[PDB]
């Protein structure tokens, strides 16, 4: 069917939907299911037992937040079906899923059962004309408009580094670590309890993510800022109460660059970028250092590019040009890539038709992926 394809980013934190024609995603809402915290027997309470996106944000304190997708993998599929149904609601897009074809953006090196079940839902529950699963990293390059480039895509659920040179992705050089934005939000809650402010509730976890997003700066030297006495910058909560964050502000997102501090066995965001380049062939190393692209929401931390440049330089070889080319629209970069890809006439060949999936089998989605 010729009618405009619907791009949808499967972001663990925020799913971004919209049409391929639009330069930006019109409808982007948080990826969580909202049910009433108190188990509702009585009338005059929150009805439906389902609150998604803007409806949830309004009555947030009353509801109990449960993320359906963890570490770029779908844990509860029933929840994810309701989320994708809300994408084709009167609230967002307001269209038939049966008419328009779909593009998914699954993280690299995900389970094959995750891709197979994702297709089954979108072909059976929704009567889609055609579906195409793609890598988040490959899209990010289409948006910026360069063929060569390493893509350090720091999402909410997973942070992954994929090196692609002249439209060729080395699949062995891909690096994936689970320590992402959501873990930084979890570790900030621990340090906020060490400052003396508890956020025990699942609703109260959402305002820790807001505190992180508002006020958390990455110091170039962490040891100097610790010895220096903090200003203790006040943050205002939804109720109106003030909280002085203090040293927790800067030593929370540090755990990205040094995850051994809390006690998580991972490489680190500076390390995975360098290791991904060093794993690739010697001839390409210089060009891959010379073309680095930051993607996702967990790069927007104040002074992230400043710290990463410094942490990469000392690990990388001496007298090598390191350009970390961040776009202005890092959060919405992954979708814009899909929107451009979808618009091209080549995409018509790439996607798998509904009749193709019935005849060919299950492999059809996997083999056409690349």
């Amino acid at each position: 069917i010729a009618n405009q394809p619907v791009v949808i980013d499967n972001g663990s934190g925020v799913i971004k939907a919209g049409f391929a024609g639009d330069q930006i995603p019109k409808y982007c809402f948080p990826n969580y299911v909202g049910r009433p915290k108190h188990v509702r027997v009585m009338a005059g309470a929150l009805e439906g037992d389902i609150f998604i996106g803007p409806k949830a944000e309004e009555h947030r304190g009353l509801l109990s937040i449960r993320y359906p997708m963890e570490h770029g993998i779908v844990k509860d599929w029933n929840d994810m079906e309701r989320i994708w149904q809300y994408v084709y609601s009167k609230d967002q897009l307001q269209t038939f899923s049966e008419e328009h074809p779909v593009l998914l953006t699954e993280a690299p090196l995900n389970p094959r059962k995750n891709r197979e079940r994702a297709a089954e839902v979108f072909f059976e529950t929704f009567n889609v004309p055609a579906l195409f699963i793609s890598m988040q990293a490959v899209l990010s390059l289409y948006a910026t408009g360069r063929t060569t480039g390493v893509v350090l895509d720091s999402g909410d659920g997973v942070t992954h580094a994929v090196p692609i040179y002249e439209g060729f992705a080395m699949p062995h050089s891909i690096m994936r670590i689970d320590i992402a934005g959501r873990d930084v939000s979890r570790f900030l809650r621990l340090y906020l309890r060490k400052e003396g402010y508890d956020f025990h509730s699942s609703s109260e976890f959402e305002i820790v993510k807001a505190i992180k997003e508002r006020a958390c700066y990455l110091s170039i030297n962490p040891q100097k800022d610790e010895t220096l006495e903090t200003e203790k910058a006040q943050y205002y909560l939804p109720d109106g109460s003030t909280i002085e964050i203090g040293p927790s502000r800067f030593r929370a997102p540090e755990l990205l660059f040094r995850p051994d501090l809390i006690g998580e066995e991972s490489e680190g965001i500076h390390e995975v970028l360098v290791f991904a380049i060093q794993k690739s062939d010697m001839d390409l190393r210089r060009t891959l250092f010379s073309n680095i692209v930051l993607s996702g929401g967990s790069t927007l931390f104040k002074g992230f590019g400043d710290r990463l440049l410094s942490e990469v330089k000392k690990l990388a070889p001496k007298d090598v040009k390191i350009r970390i080319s961040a776009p202005q629209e890092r959060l919405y970069s992954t979708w814009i890539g899909g929107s451009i890809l979808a618009s091209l006439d080549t995409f018509k060949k790439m996607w798998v038709s509904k009749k193709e999936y019935e005849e060919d089998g299950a492999r059809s989605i996997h083999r056409k992926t690349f």
Binding site: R112, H172, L261, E265
Partner: protein, 370 residues
Amino acid sequence: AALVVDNGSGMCKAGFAGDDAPRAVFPSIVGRPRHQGVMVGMGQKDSYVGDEAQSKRGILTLKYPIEHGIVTNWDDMEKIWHHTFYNELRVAPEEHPVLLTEAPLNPKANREKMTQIMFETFNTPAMYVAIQAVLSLYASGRTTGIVMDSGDGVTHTVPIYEGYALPHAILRLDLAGRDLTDYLMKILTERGYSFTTTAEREIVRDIKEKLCYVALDFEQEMATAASSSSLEKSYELPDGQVITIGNERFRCPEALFQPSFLGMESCGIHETTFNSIMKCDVDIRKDLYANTVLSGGTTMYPGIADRMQKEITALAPSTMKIKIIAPPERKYSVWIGGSILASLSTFQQMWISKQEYDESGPSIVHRKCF
């Protein structure tokens, strides 16, 4: 009275010369704890080694000191040798002379620094480095024939005819047990079961040793794996959780025979064994086909010998008879050779003494290596 100490990348096999099997066999690893700023409890060792670190895997970050038969961290290797002599063997290094094993075509600094420690740190009376492949022949009571000694660190092919080695015919391949263990993690992550940490990698090695087997026809085995669930076997983890690895069982050891899977762009363990025989003199080829030995624990995969014979026979001429030598004790084939060598009265002269080391230096080892 003399000590044989195999310095394998996977496992360190140590024991007394003359004995049938090695006394102490432990995994060659150093376990440093994921410590926070919180104070630690009592009975705390700063760095654990071997069977102790194998018991306390959960918290300790497992760091293999020897990578591809090259000692990367010498301070770590020193702590293993200290655990080998004093604790495991219960013997003074000053009393007994120590035989060590190095893989062929290793860096010259490795053999140099190895002996320097044995002479200075441990104060050994005599020290001789030997090629692992040269020892492995003595195990089978065969002077003539090639060996395919595939270890955890490296795999090497050393052709030796009538007690005379062909140095230029020796070929080294970096593909080994640890690369297969790393490969098995990736394909298990594709199934669903994610293993990231250093402790988890050790559990994946236990899965590999028990279940994984070499297929005769890979394409035929993949067809049976797709249709029937007969090859699918269950394994219980340290946790009560059980996993069904399926087709990935026989997919892991395939990487040996076709490195393209791992993405090394090199010849297979079958093809390198053929290439090594062809590099040798035309006359002696006959005996090398007739006496092809498989050594190390990477040749204890069920049915590697059958697959090896098939692949060599196809490459080799039709008239030639290809017999693969697979003794029951392949894991301890390097050590048992060392025990036979050290015991022989002829070898008494070949030892490098302290007096010889003191006058000449550590460079003397390169002359009296092989």
